[PDB]
Structure formats: C-alpha cells, structure tokens
Amino acid sequence: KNFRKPGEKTFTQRSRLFVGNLPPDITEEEMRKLFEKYGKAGEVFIHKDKGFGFIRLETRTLAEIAKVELDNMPLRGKQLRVRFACHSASLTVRNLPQYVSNELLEEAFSVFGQVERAVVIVDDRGRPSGKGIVEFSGKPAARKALDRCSEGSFLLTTFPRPVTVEPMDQLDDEEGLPEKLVIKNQQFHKEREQPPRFAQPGSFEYEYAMRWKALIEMEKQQQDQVDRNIKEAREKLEMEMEAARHE
C-alpha cells in the first residue's frame, strides 16, 4: 500500500517472482492482469511453450503477498506455482573491519557494478558479526567482485585486512519443508513408524543415541581446539597489523 522499507530499492531481484505451470500461450498482458492487484510490474517474461515465466514486482512486501495469495491458484485446469526467483548475484563478505556501515559496504562494492543492497549483519546486541551481504543487480558484477576480491586485497578501511567474498549460500528459514513436499516413499514410512519420543534406557535406540551424543562431544573437542589455534593465529597477526599502522 505504497509500502517501502527505508533503504529498499525497487524492482530488485528480491521482488522477482517465478510463475510455473502456466497454461499454454497466456499473453504477456494476461500475466499482468493476474498480478494487477499487487502494484506495478516491471520485467515480464513468459516462455514460448514450457509454461513458465517471471514477473518483477515493486517491493519485496508486495511480492510476498502476491506469492502466498497466488501460489497454487487454479486457472483453466492447472495449479499455478509461484515462488521467489533464486537470486543470481548475492555475495557473502567475511572479515569486515570495524567502522563499516551498510552504506560504506554498498559504496565499496559499487565499483564492481550496480548494487541492489548491502547489509552489515549485526547480532542481537547490535554489534556487527563481521559478515555482510552484497546483492548486485546482475550476475556480471558479482563475478567481477568475486574474481577481483580473490586475486587482490580489497580493503574497506585503513586497517590492512582484506575482506573475503564468496557466493551467498541461500537457505530458506521461512517456508521450510511443508509436510506436503516431503518425498513419501518406503523410507518415509520407515522413518515415521514411531512418533517423536525420548529414547528409554535398555532399548536399542538408547545405545546408539548415547554413542551419537558421545560423537558430538568428540566433535566439540576437536573443533574447540581448532578454534583455539585459530583465535591465536589471528590475534597474533592482528597485533602486528595494528602496531604496523602506528605511524
């Protein structure tokens, strides 16, 4: 309803919807009139024959609503499939230095291409975790930044520690895996014979649960000591970095 989150750019990849199971033909415009109620729409693409297309709505909010309202809707004789398109150009930035803001991160990565958003991630106290996100409008810009940031040392502040840039690992902690989408085969039925429950001493489960809990503890040991060598090696190198810059 005119709603734009402060900072949000419009018609970014994050408000772009995939539309699947379309009926044969469907003019571009028809596609548009389905999404009429959900605001203006930029790019529209329908595929010749394979019955899918993309629509780019204005704000992410507008697209969420349109997503859950139109997902599965029948038209002629088939269920629409409507999901947020996979982002083609989102990057994880690691080891951000201190005094970096969303806007600095954006400015820095602007030299690689047009930036849809950049966010310095903060924990529940508001302190930056050291990771960021950078989403470009096009795959070419993220390829530039990926490549140039591995070959060279990209420095955001005077602190001589370069950020590490890798592709963003896109996880969905919102829709998840509805019971409707679980593969229901023989293994499914085997998993589901018993309901959730606590393993009881003397059962065959209990013996293996304890072995697993022990293994998880053997992983805590190993991993807690790597963390050891790692927090040491970094602190060593960061002192020398800070001392060096004393000039």
Binding positions for ligand A1JB9, rule: CB under 6 A: 85-89, 124, 139, 142-143, 146, 167, 170
What is the enclosing helix (H) or strand (E) of 52? Answer: strand 52-57
Under the criterion CB under 8 A, does residue 223 sit at the interface with a second copy?
yes
Under the criterion CB under 8 A, does residue 133 sit at the interface with a second copy?
yes
Q: How many other β-carbons are positioned within 10 Å of the β-carbon of residue 91?
A: 22
Is the separation of the CB atoms in 23 and 87 below 8 Å?
Answer: no
The site partner of 143 among ligand A1JB9, a second copy, none (C-beta below 5 to 8 Å per kind) is ligand A1JB9
What contacts 37, CB < 8 A, 6 or more positions away? 66
Residue selected from 9, 61, 75, 143 as contacting a second copy according to rule CB under 8 A: 61
The residue among 45 and 208 lying less far from ligand A1JB9, judged by its C-beta, is 45
The residue among 151 and 247 lying less far from ligand A1JB9, judged by its C-beta, is 151
* Span from 19-27, 47-55, 136-144, 238-246 in contact with a second copy (CB under 8 A): 238-246
Is the separation of the CB atoms in 82 and 20 below 8 Å?
Answer: yes
As measured in angstroms, the least distance from the Cβ of 91 to ligand A1JB9 is 7
Token pair, residue 195, equals 């309901």
Residue selected from 107, 134, 202, 228 as contacting a second copy according to rule CB under 8 A: 107
Under the criterion CB under 8 A, does residue 202 sit at the interface with a second copy?
no
Alpha carbons 136 and 145: distance in angstroms, whole number: 10
* Span from 20-28, 45-53, 58-66, 137-145 in contact with a second copy (CB under 8 A): 58-66
What is the enclosing helix (H) or strand (E) of 34? Answer: helix 28-34
Alpha carbons 108 and 118: distance in angstroms, whole number: 10
Is the separation of the CB atoms in 119 and 105 below 8 Å?
Answer: yes
Under the criterion CB under 8 A, does residue 210 sit at the interface with a second copy?
yes
